[PDB]
C-alpha cells in the first residue's frame, strides 16, 4: 500500500505539481528510433503497396520527467498511458493508408527522465514488389521522421543501422534478404531535415 | 431504492490504481474460449479467430465490507472506471475488434472479472489445413509493458475451452492449448510471461 | 407562442431534474426485465467460404425504471420525451455469436415516458456464425443467433418477448434471400462457466435464395 | 474595426447558446432536398447500391432568431453542428452506416433558420436487375426521422425533382429519372402520422 | 552550466505563457466584414489505384494550407524571441477545405499539428488519401486519362473565405517514381462559380493527367 502511495505521489508530482510544451530551437530534442520487423503481410502488384507489421521503438529524455528514487520508495521507473505525456510526431513519409495500432499506447518512464514507447503498427506504404518472385527479390524503402519539427527542434538517431529481425515471422509469405535503418540529413528552407530510412529487400518464401 | 442508494454510494466511495510494481506485483489469470475459426488466408498467411477471453485479478484498493453497503457483494461497471491489464496478442496483423461490452464485474474481496470477446487476425500459415494432419498455428498473449516481476500471468488449465466452438465452422479443431511460458532476453535478468495459444485445425 | 417557450422550459427543467439532480444498473435486489422484439429487414449476404451471414434488422428494446418517472402535471403535461441514448442507462444486449462488431444504422436516441418506461430501437447490421448450406434448395438453410446481456445473469436481467414471431412486415421484397420462417424465443441458458443462467432470445431464421 | 465585428459575432453566439428538440406542443418542419452526385456501384450479388449525394436540410427555431441591428448587422453565422440541435434524418433501408463526406458545420440565419448540408455515401437495398437494358433499373429508399412522428417533425420538399445538375457526367451509371416525394403513412394502432421522403432513382448502365 | 539549464527552463516557460495568452486568455471564423484568404497548394505523392469498375481513383498527396489572423500575432521580444510554435490543430480555427467529389471519407496520414508564426500566419499541411470520381478510361494510352477534383470551403462562400494559389503547378518533386501510374501533368487552378444564390463560390481545381507504367 505504501509502494502504491509512493507511485501515485510520484505521478501526481510529475503530472500536476510541475509544468513540457514540446521541443524548440532553444530546447531541441533527440529521438532514437529502432524497428523490429515482424511480418511482410501482403505485397500488392496492382497498386504497388506493401503491408508491414513492425514494432517501432522510440526513445527520448526530458529533464522534467526526472526524479530521485530515494524520495519515492526507490521507484526507478513506471508505466503510464502515452496520452499522459508528450510524444514525438514520428510519421511514415510514404504511407498510403492511416497506420493501424496493434498494441496498447503505454510508455515506460525511467527516473533519469528517459521515455521508451514501442507501438506495434501495421503500415501500408509505396512499394513496387517487381522481382519479389525472383532470386534477387524486391527492394523497397520508407522514410520516418517528424512531420512538423525540423532538425533544429528534433534530431533523430538509431542505436543500430541493422533492423531487428529476431521477431520476424518464420512462416511469412516473404523472407527478408536484408533490412537496414539509416539516419539521413537533407537540406527552400535553411534548417536541415532528418529522417530514418527503412530499407527492406525481400522475396517470396 | 435503498439498494440503489447503497450501490451508488459504494461506487462513489471506491472510485473517489497506478498499476502494479515490483514491490506490489499483480497476478492476472487468463483463459480462452474459442468460438470460431472464421477465415484462413493462404495468400497472406493470416488466420481469423473469434473467442472470448476470461481475465481475472484482485486489488486491495477495490475491497469493501458488504455490511457497510446494504450487503452488496458485487457490481457491474464500465471497464473505463477501473485499471485493466494490457494483455495483448504479440503477432496480430490487424487491430483486435471488440465483440462484447466493455464492462467488468467487481467483487467485494477486490477481485475483478473481465471477459472481452474479440475477432483477431494473426500470423498463421494454414498449409496442411486440407490434409488429415491439419494446420498448426500459435499466438502469444501477454502484457505489452510489464515484466513477470510486475504482472505474473497464470492459467487455470492448459486446455482451451472448446465447449462453445461453432459446430458448423468451415474448420474443425483438432486441439487447442493455452500454455504459460516464462521467457528471458539476454539483455535482462527479469522474466517475461506470456500465454501461448496453440491451435491445430483442419477443413 | 409564449406557450411554446413555456413547453421548452418545462422539458429542459424535466430533463435537468431527471439527469442533473439524480441509475447504476440492475442488481439481484433490484432486477430488470427487458422486452425484446426483432424486425428483420434483409439478409444481405451469405458467405459460404467463411460461414458468416449478414443481417439487417431493427431491435426493439423496452424497460421501465422508477427513477425515470415524473408527474406530467408538474411539467406542463409533458408525457414523454426523446433523448440521446448516452443520457440514460441502456442494457448491454449482445449477439452471442457475432463475427464482427455490430454496425449501427440508426440515431442513438431513445423515448422516455412519464411512467418511467424506455423504448430504444437500434437498427443494426450483424455478421454472425451461419452455415448457409442448403440455401440454394427448396428446404433452404437454417441459422440461429442468441441475443442477451453479456455481463448480467438472469438474476439481474430477465428478458421477455411480446411474440415469438419475428416481424417480417418490413422485409426487403427484392432481397437475394427469401424468408421461410423467423422466430424469436426466450431461453434460460446455462453456461458451464457459471452457476447462474443467462437469459437470451434465440433468433432462428430459415431462408433460401429467391 | 475588425475586432468589433469579431466581438459582435462572439457575443451573439454567447447570447444564443447561453434547445431540447421538437415536441407536439413545439413542433418543427424540416425541408429536405437531394443533390445526387454519383451512383458509385451496384452489387447484384447482394442487391446493394452505393450513392453519393448531399442532402439539404432546413428548419427554423424561434430560439435562434436575433436582430441584426443589435449585433453589428450580422445576418448569419457558421457553427459546428455539435453546437446546435439537428434532426435525426435517417435512411430507412441502408445496409451500412452512412459515411459523411463533408464537415459537420451548419449555417444559422437571423430569422432563426438553420441550413445543414451533409454529403454522404450510402449503401442501400436495391436490386439492379435491368440496369443493362433500355428500361434500366429502379430503386428507392425512404428518409425520415427515426424517433419523431409527424406530430413533432413534419417533412417537406421544395420540389419533387432531385437536383441532377451536379451528377457525375462520367459515372458508370446514368440517371433516367430521380424524384423525392413526401409520403404520409397512417396506422390503425397509433393516432400519429409518420412522414418520410421517398427517393426514387431510375438508372441504367452508361 | 547552470545558466544554460536555466535558459531552457525560461524558454519553456515563455512558450507556455505565449500559448496561454493566445488561447485561454482569448477565433469565431471569417465573416462578410472580415473575409479570410486561404492559400492552397498540392504536393502529389502517388496515384495508388484507378478503379475502372466504379470510376474511382485514389490519390495520396499533402495539402498545404496557409492563412493569417491578427488574433494570433505576438511580439517576439515579449516572449524570449519566440518567433513561431507548433500546436495541435484542435487548439485553433482551421478552414473546412473539402473535396467536392470524394466518394469516401478522406483518410488522414499525418499528425494534425499546425505551425503558428508571430505575424499571425498559420501553416497546416495534412497528408491525405482520397478516393474521388474519375473515369480512368485512357489510362492505357499515350495521352493517358484526365481527371479533376475541386477543393474549397463547404460552408463559407466567397464572401467569407477566398482562396488563392502561389502557383498553378502541382508539386511533383515527391511523386513516387515507381507508382503504377506516371504523371503527365498536374495543375491547381482557382475558380469562381455559382450554384440560385447571390454569393460567388471559390474552389481550387486539381486536374491530373496520368497513364499506366
Ligand atoms: C455468451 N456468454 C459467453 C455467456 C453469457 C454472456 C457471455 C459471457 C458469459 N460468461 C461469464 C463468464 C464467467 C463469469 C464468472 N466467472 C468466470 C467466467 N464467462 N463467460 C457466458
Ligand atoms: C460543393 N458545394 C455543393 C458548393 C460549395 C460547397 C458545397 C455546398 C455549397 N452549397 C450551398 C448551398 C446552399 C446555401 C444556402 N441556401 C441554399 C443552398 N447548397 N450547397 C455549394
Amino acid at each position: 500500500l505504501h509502494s502504491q502511495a509512493n507511485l501515485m505521489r510520484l505521478k501526481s508530482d510529475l503530472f500536476n505539481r510541475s509544468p513540457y510544451p514540446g521541443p524548440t530551437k532553444d530546447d531541441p530534442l533527440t529521438v532514437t528510433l529502432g524497428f523490429t520487423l515482424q511480418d511482410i503481410v501482403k505485397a500488392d502488384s496492382s497498386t504497388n503497396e506493401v503491408d508491414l507489421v513492425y514494432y517501432e521503438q522510440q526513445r527520448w529524455k526530458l529533464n522534467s520527467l526526472m526524479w530521485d528514487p530515494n524520495e519515492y520508495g526507490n521507484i526507478t521507473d513506471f508505466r503510464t498511458s502515452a496520452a499522459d505525456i508528450w510524444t514525438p510526431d514520428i510519421t511514415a513519409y510514404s504511407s498510403t493508408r492511416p497506420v493501424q495500432v496493434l498494441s496498447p499506447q503505454i510508455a515506460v518512464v525511467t527516473h533519469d527522465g528517459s521515455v521508451m514507447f514501442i507501438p506495434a503498427q501495421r503500415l501500408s506504404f509505396m512499394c513496387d514488389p517487381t522481382g519479389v518472385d525472383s532470386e534477387e527479390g524486391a527492394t523497397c524503402a520508407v522514410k520516418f521522421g517528424s512531420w512538423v519539427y525540423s532538425g533544429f527542434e528534433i534530431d533523430l538517431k538509431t542505436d543500430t543501422d541493422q533492423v531487428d529481425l529476431s521477431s520476424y515471422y518464420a512462416s511469412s509469405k516473404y523472407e527478408i534478404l536484408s533490412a537496414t535503418q539509416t539516419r539521413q540529413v537533407q537540406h527552400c528552407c535553411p534548417e536541415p531535415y532528418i529522417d530514418v530510412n527503412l530499407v527492406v529487400k525481400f522475396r517470396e518464401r
Side-chain angles (χ1 to χ4, degrees), chain A residues 23 27-32 59-61 153-157:
Chain A
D27 183 28
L29 184 68
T30 295
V31 175
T32 304
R59 188 170 61 83
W60 64 97
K61 175 183 198 302
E153 287 106 14
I154 292 182
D155 192 11
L156 304 182
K157 57 191 297 296

Side-chain angles (χ1 to χ4, degrees), chain A residues 93-117:
Chain A
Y93 284 175
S94 50
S95 70
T96 59
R97 301 200 174 274
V99 171
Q100 291 176 276
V101 181
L102 310 180
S103 57
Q105 297 300 71
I106 305 165
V108 180
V109 180
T110 301
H111 66 95
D112 63 338
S114 61
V115 181
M116 188 180 60
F117 180 48

Side-chain angles (χ1 to χ4, degrees), chain A residues 31 33 35 56 58 88-92 121 144-147 154 156:
Chain A
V31 175
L33 293 179
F35 290 93
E56 188 186 310
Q58 306 178 350
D89 69 325
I90 305 307
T91 310
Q121 300 184 343
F144 298 81
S146 182
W147 194 251
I154 292 182
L156 304 182

Side-chain angles (χ1 to χ4, degrees), chain A residues 7 23 38 45 48 57 71 99 110 116 149 163 172 178 188 197:
Chain A
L7 178 58
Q38 195 171 17
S45 64
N48 286 358
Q57 183 177 129
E71 307 276 36
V99 171
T110 301
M116 188 180 60
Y149 293 100
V163 166
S172 179
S178 67
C188 138
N197 188 40

Side-chain angles (χ1 to χ4, degrees), chain A residues 118-137:
Chain A
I118 314 169
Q121 300 184 343
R122 181 189 178 121
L123 168 75
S124 298
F125 74 105
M126 309 173 190
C127 169
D128 171 13
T130 301
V132 72
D133 58 341
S134 87
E135 189 66 25
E136 23 274 291

